[PDB]
Amino acid sequence: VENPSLDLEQYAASYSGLMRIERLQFIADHCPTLRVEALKMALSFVQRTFNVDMYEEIHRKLSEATRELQNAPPALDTAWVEATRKKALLKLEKLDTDLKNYKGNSIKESIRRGHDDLGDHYLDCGDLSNALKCYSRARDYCTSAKHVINMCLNVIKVSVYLQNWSHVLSYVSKAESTPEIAEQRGERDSQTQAILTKLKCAAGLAELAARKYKQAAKCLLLASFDHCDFPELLSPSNVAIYGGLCALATFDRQELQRNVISSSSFKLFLELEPQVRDIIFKFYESKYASCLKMLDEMKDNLLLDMYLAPHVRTLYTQIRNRALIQYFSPYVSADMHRMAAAFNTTVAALEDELTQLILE
Amino acid sequence: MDVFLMIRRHKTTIFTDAKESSTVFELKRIVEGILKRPPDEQRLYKDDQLLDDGKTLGECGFTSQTARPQAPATVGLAFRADDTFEALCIEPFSSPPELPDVMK
Amino acid sequence: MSLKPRVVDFDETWNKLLTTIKAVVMLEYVERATWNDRFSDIYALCVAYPEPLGERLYTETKIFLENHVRHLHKRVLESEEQVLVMYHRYWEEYSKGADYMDCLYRYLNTQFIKKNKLTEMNEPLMEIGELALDMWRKLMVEPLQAILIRMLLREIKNDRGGEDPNQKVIHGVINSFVHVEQYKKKFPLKFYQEIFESPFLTETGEYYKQEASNLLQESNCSQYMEKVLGRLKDEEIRCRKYLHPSSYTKVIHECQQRMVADHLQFLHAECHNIIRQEKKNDMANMY
Amino acid sequence: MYVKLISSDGHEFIVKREHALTSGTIKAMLSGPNEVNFREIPSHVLSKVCMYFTYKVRYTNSSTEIPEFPIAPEIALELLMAANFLDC
């Protein structure tokens, strides 16, 4: 399933990390011939951030892609591999020795800082269990509540890839509801602090996985336009797509005029989204043809959105059903031929759609 | 690694400490922390390698499992002369029969 | 381990053990050579298989320690304040002496504290230090309270006038009060507060009130208040010579409240006078 | 001055003055800067505890490998149950 409506230049700019690898994965799942160059750019990315195992994994899957490039038209710097890996293991011993030295120095700020940095370097390894040890030994070893917040932020950055939302959501809610957010200030009194909007993105991924999408969009409502920055999760066009379309899919028309048009916190995000704004305009003016048209056009690009990909099929089905209810409501006698013109369909297949709706 | 050496004779047994990046000259300076010995006219012999003062163990390769703390490959001490070697007596343990249960 | 019979070698080890311990009982002058002897004691303890033996051995050590304390109790039988100094010497050395015993004891601790101790019947297994304090408090009964605290009281007298016989002795007697306290160390402070402090507060408060009151009438009351301010400080001085955390804390304010009864009125009256006529220093002291 | 360990089977090991920080226990018994003795138990316990102490002086604060100490094959269940019997 190949959609060429993607912007990898923005995702190279606004993002980095595993998602640069992972969206290629959906390329590698469904959307080919968009793969090898971003695979080599990701291979050059994993030439940084201390990662050798996954570097060799990208070299291996790039060799697979090279076997595919025996029809269509890899780099293993083993000197770099051995040098960086021995430097990383020796610095693991350096920081174990420094952990000894700083327990000798006994600064829980600096000790728990070392726990945080070691968990960061185990993210740099991919050792989510060892980073879980380090942040588990940064867990109740902090000084202020802000540092517990930063710990839970790092654990949520891991939880981007953990997604084991039984107690991964206990860490997510440990950042959300637990730490008396900014100690009764609200990310220090009119947030620019990219924490609560990270909790928007985290709840979006979580109830993407845990499928209570109404509460996910309910989280995604009130994001702040001030920061909008992270090179793995937060770009305001993509999070704007997230919030606007989850709110369009999950919320009633009472709230679709009451909390979508009125959403001033999210207003500049839809200023970043002209097409989402036009879909909003056509759907609220009940212009079903071009609205569901643009909906199903960007359905392929939100199928290119890897995590939204299984759920966009459900939710745009719901939005089309919402449009059909929007048509069916105000009348006693509607021509289906008018409805065939309105929903860009036939009569009989439209009738089968409506019969599927007649079922419940 | 950070290598806890075990210079092991029958009774001459020094548990000293060194690195993978450590040399032999300053190891003898740590032997000078043991029994106050000049490195210059002495050579730590293992009967395995010509080990002069400036030879680095990264060139030798005393890694973590090749030189463990509780059980290294010991950079050998000589019973100090030009070409001698402290007699390596790695001390034996006990040899049990199959598992008793009374001693738990 | 299975090296030899666990029961047998008590006597030889104990002989070496006592030989070295006596050298340390409060202090037999252990030197480096003697330390070597103590190490041979390490040999003695280590040769034994002290698993059933060590507790008995420590018990024997306890008995010897107790008799030594008794010997010292015989030794406390002396003159006046010289004894305070001697007692201070006993306590000072005794801590070190028992401490060295503990050093020898260090291995025994791992033998029974790790394995099995009461502290985890009349057979306790704990520190020699905790043991020594208990044995030592037996010493603490008569000489501490009878002479030593009284001497400290005289030192209080020295606060009123004179200078403290030696603080080594007198403060040390206070320390004797504290060391000889509950072995549990639940109340480390209690003896000084119980035996001594009541008459301390009583006499000090009463004397300052009475004398200072007479002198207050005699020598310029406003300034005399300043003098009282100094007076309590002098009390503080001597209370510093021999000290306990509870005495000075209460006794100073006690005098303040006592004396203010004489002049609650002059405080504001003279204060008003300060308002009327600027007297900053009087204001400072009065403040 | 300098110290020395003695075992039941004669492990009379010369133990340092200055940099003996690899040891923990004998540092308490530095009668200097000497006859440390553990002769009543056979050395299958004593040398085990000494090598485990060298092991243990190193391998603290180690988020990497802290290996379970190798214990004899007929007691390969006491490979774990040396926690029950001989602390390794």
Numbering used by the authors:
A (entry chain A): 77 to 149, 160 to 446
B (entry chain P): 1 to 104
C (entry chain O): 1 to 120, 132 to 298
D (entry chain Q): 17 to 49, 58 to 112
Authors' text:
The CRL2 E3 ligase consists of a Cullin 2 (CUL2) scaffold in association with a catalytic RING-box protein (RBX1), with the substrate adaptors Elongin B (ELOB) and C (ELOC) at its N-terminal. When associated with the von Hippel–Lindau (VHL) tumour suppressor substrate receptor, the CRL2 complex is the primary regulator of the Hypoxia Inducible Factor 1-α (HIF-1α) transcription factor. Activation of CRL2, in common with other members of the CRL family, involves a cascade of E1, E2 and E3 enzymes, which conjugate the ubiquitin-like protein NEDD8 (N8) to residue K689 on the CUL2 scaffold. CSN5 is responsible for the deneddylase activity of the CSN.
